[PDB]
């Protein structure tokens with residue numbers, strides 16, 4: 206009821222600390238496929254048996270583990286996803302979103318709401334993407350974190366959008382190529398380009414080779430504020446526009462408009478907020494995403510009306526917004542050049 | 546499913562920061578019974594309209610508010626409970642559990658699991674109850690926080706335990722008298738004593754007078770390690786034993802045994818953990834409670850077997866464990882003197 210829901214919201218930070226400890230101590234990999242004894246696990250992570258037991262009991266209480274017998278633990282399907290080696294692993298995602306880099310800025314949430322600018326810069330001394338460009342191990346974690354987040358979209362997009370009419374697709378800020386890989390895997394004759402920062406482009410180039418898509422997926426690097434590489438039939442921009450304030454978004458959509466020319470189409474893959482906020486079945490709460498974008502980057506999530514205006518301004522019209530399955534929490538906004 | 550549950554656990558800390566901001570900014574009292582315009586609310590808390598709007602949208606997304614029209618907000622039943630003036634208010638509870646005093650120690654959870662002792666002492670420079678004895682405004686908040694938590698138990702205990710056979714009941718560590726008040730309100734001829742620290746006894750004395758129970762409820766102060774006042778038919782100890790390590794608990798139960806003498810009974814009102822950890826329908830997760838007791842006090846939650854042993858040792862036998870409604874998450878453990 207009403208009181209239980211409030212209690213659940215209030216104790217979220219303590220729940221996150223329990224999950225953060227599981228992730229940092231690599232307990233999911235320690236347990237793996239079997240039933241593990243707390244005493245055996247205790248010698249794997251430099252915690253005493255009693256302390257590790259209480260942590261594992263909380264993880265069982267939170268649906269991440271099962272205590273089959275006293276002191277004997279197996280993973281649930283949820284806990285299995287924190288294994289580094291799970292085929293659907295979100296281990297790096299879990300580490301990224303529990304790192305000081307992504308959590309310390311939330312300690313100043315009110316300042317971010319007051320100033321309208323990110324608190325990340327205050328805590329770490331530069332904007333997030335500049336900071337990561339100078340911290341290769343955080344950059345590495347971020348690339349893997351966005352892969353983990355994008356799995357839900359990558360696994361569903363090609364079943365909710367017809368890619369068959371296109372010869373070429375360019376993913377603008379396409380990360381390590383998780384999204385474009387999933388699309389190319391379903392369309393053998395389709396050709397791809399990932400457009401990224403030089404740093405992330407290095408990760409994407411290796412991913413494309415590792416995935417055996419080198420022959421029909423290229424990687425190009427640059428600055429989507431400077432330009433987007435031209436000549437493609439379809440442009441994707443996923444989980445990118447929400448990183449930026451309204452003016453920076455127009456500048457990105459402006460680079461996209463030039464690339465579209467006559468016969469180009471843009472697919473904006475992002476949260477489309479309703480005009481009136483309400484509870485959402487998305488795996489990741491879109492209003493928490495909105496405030497994450499504020500504190501980390503000075504970005505935000507947007508309604509169809511807020512984006513339709515930013516398109517209008519870039520010389521683009523929102524043609525059509527297509528849904529994904531409710532658990533994904535992103536929509537496909539088709540954008541074409543404005544008739545003007 | 547599995548992935549959505551993991552995502553929910555990981556983003557708990559950001560959800561808590563949103564609720565903490567609602568509580569600190571007194572937004573529940575600002576909105577109150579009506580529909581409030583974001584622009585009118587913005588001039589109540591020194592946030593700009595846009596920033597406050599995004600916070601309120603997240604609160605609507607988390608079930609604390611309703612956006613009836615764009616920029617127009619009402620409380621839900623859950624949000625209503627954060628009003629200072631709500632008859633079932635947990636406002637002080639919300640402020641206490643989002644204060645640095647109760648959250649900073651969680652930043653060192655692993656150290657607490659490693660050392661088995663509280664991280665509060667390291668952060669704030671003394672044990673929690675000593676610290677609060679020296680910080681009257683935190684002591685005040687704590688008294689009101691425990692009242693808010695105890696409402697669920699106070700509203701249910703007398704319907705799940707027969708108090709009619711007793712002439713006198715003494716609440717050992719009875720806080721501001723929330724629990725004993727609820728019992729006395731249902732038993733007009735029953736007499737009560739609250740046994741507390743001098744500091745909290747001041748709060749209980751005022752509460753008993755305010756509630757019109759002065760004529761049949763007394764307040765006495767001292768140290769339950771020194772003694773528990775004798776001569777009562779029934780002793781209550783609620784949310785107290787979980788504050789202490791096993792040896793301190795035996796010392797408290799030892800004071801209780803002396804007070805029971807021949808015809809005295811003890812009711813231990815606390816979490817009774819199962820031997821094997823699993824998800825729990827309690828409004829407050831008992832394993833998160835366990836780790837809260839570790840980081841703040843070096844306490845813990847206990848199984849019936851763990852408590853039955855600590856009783857045996859105090860010269861007491863666990864007679865019988867009685868359930869409360871599943872949402873409460875506390876049980877009534879009847880304890881009588883050990884036959885020996």
Ligand SMILES: Nc1ncnc2c1ncn2[C@@H]1O[C@H](CSCC[C@H](N)C(=O)O)[C@@H](O)[C@H]1O
Pocket residue numbers: 334351352355377378379380381383384400401402405427428429430442443444445448
């Ligand atoms: N100026 C710029 N030019 C090009 N790419 C940029 C950029 N600034 C940031 N980026 C890239 O924008 C991406 C946003 S994260 C989204 C990654 C991917 N589309 C996914 O959904 O998983 C990052 O990978 C970052 O490297």
Ligand SMILES: Nc1ncnc2c1ncn2[C@@H]1O[C@H](CSCC[C@H](N)C(=O)O)[C@@H](O)[C@H]1O
Pocket residue numbers: 674691692695717718719720721723724740741742745767768769770782783784785788
């Ligand atoms: N040495 C001591 N002697 C007596 N009371 C003590 C004590 N140390 C702590 N306490 C009291 O123990 C209480 C534990 S909190 C529980 C309060 C109440 N039973 C409720 O459930 O709401 C506090 O109110 C604190 O003041």
Ligand SMILES: CCCCCC(=O)Nc1c2sscc-2n(C)c1=O
Pocket residue numbers: 307354444445448489490491493494497498501556
């Ligand atoms: C319930 C909240 C979920 C938040 C998910 C989130 O923040 N995703 C995210 C982040 S964090 S730093 C950069 C990014 N980008 C590009 C993202 O898409």
Ligand SMILES: CCCCCC(=O)Nc1c2sscc-2n(C)c1=O
Pocket residue numbers: 216647694784785788829830831833834837838841
């Ligand atoms: C999901 C976690 C809920 C935690 C509830 C909690 O911690 N209660 C608490 C605290 S905090 S400081 C002293 C105390 N006492 C006596 C308590 O009973």
